[PDB]
Amino acid sequence: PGLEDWEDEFDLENAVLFEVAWEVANKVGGIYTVLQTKAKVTGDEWGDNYFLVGPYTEQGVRTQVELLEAPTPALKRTLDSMNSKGCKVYFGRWLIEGGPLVVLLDVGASAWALERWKGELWDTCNIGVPWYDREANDAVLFGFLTTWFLGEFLAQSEEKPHVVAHFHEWLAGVGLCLCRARRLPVATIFTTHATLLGRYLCAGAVDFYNNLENFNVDKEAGERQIYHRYCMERAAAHCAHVFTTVSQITAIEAQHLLKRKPDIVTPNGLNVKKFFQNLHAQSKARIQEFVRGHFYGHLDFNLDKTLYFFIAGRYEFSNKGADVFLEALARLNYLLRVNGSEQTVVAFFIMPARTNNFNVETLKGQAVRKQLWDTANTVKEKFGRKLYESLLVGSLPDMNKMLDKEDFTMMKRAIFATQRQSFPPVCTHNMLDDSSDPILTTIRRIGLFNSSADRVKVIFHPEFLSSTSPLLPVDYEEFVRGCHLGVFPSYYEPWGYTPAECTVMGIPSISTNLSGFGCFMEEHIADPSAYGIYILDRRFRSLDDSCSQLTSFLYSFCQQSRRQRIIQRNRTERLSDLLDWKYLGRYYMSARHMALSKAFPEHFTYEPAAQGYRYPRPASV
Amino acid sequence: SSEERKERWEQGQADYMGADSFDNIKRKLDTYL
């Protein structure tokens, strides 16, 4: 089912959508990609009545925004006015798939108003940003500039349209609060993509989710010198016609930290066109060549029985669950050894870290694999030419005479290059702090040294995968498509971008019910594991018990036949439509309709989601 | 109070356990809602 026909009974009444985010036209997070990929559907629903309001940055305009003249006289008039009133407001087209119009506000250009604005802010919300907080002061400037733009756009518009302003973090929350305080006619959505407290409370506290009700949010933000940022976020959530979260776990966090249950959850959709079995085969061949190089001299395990697990994303050890994955990898190593399995699990940790360079053993192993591959290819081409020559003369090859002295010299050189005594390095790079690295510390603590006995090899690649890289000449998407199972046992993950992209790429993944993507899949798929989606229970299980469940998931994945693994990959391939904005734009549409009805009930009435996007038991299981 | 409260906000953490708690903020915001 399409997006244009969703809530088609709703008439926007020539309303104008101002989507306000600090990340509009400047990549400072993952919300930039959310806005970029959602712009297509949003502009389809709103045409040119859709404006992304961002902060002006020289890089963003240089690279992403073509500066334009306002299409309508109202926009041009407001832009000229506030440009003459001491602000520096740019208008342009964001050079992305949607081609949306962007109002960019130079917050620095209008810093002169800061003291009169933040004081004004204190006169309306009792929120006073400390001077030393650059981001909070910039948020106040951006919010006051956005509210100025909205007021001067409604004032300088004869038709006086219905304005839906959709703010996306506490950085835009100030403008939201000012829209409500000035009382100008704006239907307001507030989407929080991550509760501000949530990050600190997960990182610091031993347990954060089960203690959500037992948190003094005011006090907790107070000890961390971010009380003003917390108050800005909570006022935006409070001063919003519609409050939205990207996830149901973020919805719980916002309920217990922003003291407002989201009126709707708007999961982060994706442009699935951007992203399976033959492509997976090529990527798996490339991973297999890398593993051949990395384990040169130690290729004593069957590679056709080798499984490629990966955990990727930002190098947040506990938030991304790399600790849980490593514990489960040690337990699965024990399981595969005691069960005497011929299965091998190479688990990749693609988590960027400060690295000096590629480890010498890693680069040497890649060189050794290249040499053996070239030697085998040269000897194979010589053998093929000689064999074709022999068969052309009706002669059966005499294999003893097929290879000459030069072939044996090349092959003996290759074999000499093969010998190694040291085990393959756990990490592919030179860590600036090997002792303090959580992944390497955990690996050396649990006993995963890529030994021959270890059925689980661990390859920590503390750097993003790039095609230009010498070690792995593969970008992240192709490597992932070559893997068997993404493992993202995240503890704190308001939305799982890495597991979501893994799923869109058709790779079975392990997420958690503590992650937004994991909750979204758990509530959209009847039997997620059937579809390649393992939802680890991290809310209601201890870290040790969650490690046990992850080991169970990894072991059951290892114990699948190749036929079962293929069936499961086909199902996860089917799952990609859930994560497309063509479905997840429904929730943004309904949030905007809800806000319009709340702010303008006389003009709009809202009639309350996953219809056509439910995945029951696969018919074939 | 009031202006002194604003100056305390600007210098550092305010009385997040007292007057500058989110109760007063929520009231001064609900007046707008």
Swiss-Prot record, chain A:
<feature type="binding site">
    <location>
        <position position="193"/>
    </location>
    <ligand>
        <name>UDP-alpha-D-glucose</name>
    </ligand>
</feature>
<feature type="binding site">
    <location>
        <position position="277"/>
    </location>
    <ligand>
        <name>alpha-D-glucose 6-phosphate</name>
    </ligand>
</feature>
<feature type="binding site">
    <location>
        <position position="569"/>
    </location>
    <ligand>
        <name>alpha-D-glucose 6-phosphate</name>
    </ligand>
</feature>
<keyword id="KW-0808">Transferase</keyword>
<dbReference type="GO" id="GO:0061547">
    <property type="term" value="F:glycogen synthase activity, transferring glucose-1-phosphate"/>
</dbReference>
<feature type="binding site">
    <location>
        <position position="27"/>
    </location>
    <ligand>
        <name>UDP</name>
    </ligand>
</feature>
<comment type="pathway">
    <text>Glycan biosynthesis; glycogen biosynthesis.</text>
</comment>
<feature type="binding site">
    <location>
        <position position="280"/>
    </location>
    <ligand>
        <name>alpha-D-glucose 6-phosphate</name>
    </ligand>
</feature>
<dbReference type="GO" id="GO:0007507">
    <property type="term" value="P:heart development"/>
</dbReference>
<keyword id="KW-0219">Diabetes mellitus</keyword>
<keyword id="KW-0225">Disease variant</keyword>
<feature type="binding site">
    <location>
        <position position="284"/>
    </location>
    <ligand>
        <name>alpha-D-glucose 6-phosphate</name>
    </ligand>
</feature>
<dbReference type="Pfam" id="PF05693">
    <property type="entry name" value="Glycogen_syn"/>
</dbReference>
<dbReference type="InterPro" id="IPR008631">
    <property type="entry name" value="Glycogen_synth"/>
</dbReference>
<dbReference type="GO" id="GO:0004373">
    <property type="term" value="F:alpha-1,4-glucan glucosyltransferase (UDP-glucose donor) activity"/>
</dbReference>
<dbReference type="GO" id="GO:0016234">
    <property type="term" value="C:inclusion body"/>
</dbReference>
<feature type="binding site">
    <location>
        <position position="496"/>
    </location>
    <ligand>
        <name>UDP-alpha-D-glucose</name>
    </ligand>
</feature>
<dbReference type="GO" id="GO:0016020">
    <property type="term" value="C:membrane"/>
</dbReference>
<comment type="subunit">
    <text>Part of the GYS1-GYG1 complex, a heterooctamer composed of a tetramer of GYS1 and 2 dimers of GYG1, where each GYS1 protomer binds to one GYG1 subunit (via GYG1 C-terminus); the GYS1 tetramer may dissociate from GYG1 dimers to continue glycogen polymerization on its own.</text>
</comment>
<feature type="modified residue" description="Phosphoserine">
    <location>
        <position position="395"/>
    </location>
</feature>
<feature type="binding site">
    <location>
        <position position="565"/>
    </location>
    <ligand>
        <name>alpha-D-glucose 6-phosphate</name>
    </ligand>
</feature>
<protein>
    <recommendedName>
        <fullName>Glycogen [starch] synthase, muscle</fullName>
        <ecNumber>2.4.1.11</ecNumber>
    </recommendedName>
</protein>
UniProtKB/Swiss-Prot annotation, chain B:
<comment type="subunit">
    <text>Part of the GYS1-GYG1 complex, a heterooctamer composed of a tetramer of GYS1 and 2 dimers of GYG1, where each GYS1 protomer binds to one GYG1 subunit (via GYG1 C-terminus); the GYS1 tetramer may dissociate from GYG1 dimers to continue glycogen polymerization on its own. May also form a heterooctamer complex with GYS2 (via GYG1 C-terminus).</text>
</comment>
<comment type="similarity">
    <text>Belongs to the glycosyltransferase 8 family. Glycogenin subfamily.</text>
</comment>
<comment type="function">
    <text>Glycogenin participates in the glycogen biosynthetic process along with glycogen synthase and glycogen branching enzyme. It catalyzes the formation of a short alpha (1,4)-glucosyl chain covalently attached via a glucose 1-O-tyrosyl linkage to internal tyrosine residues and these chains act as primers for the elongation reaction catalyzed by glycogen synthase.</text>
</comment>
<protein>
    <recommendedName>
        <fullName>Glycogenin-1</fullName>
    </recommendedName>
</protein>
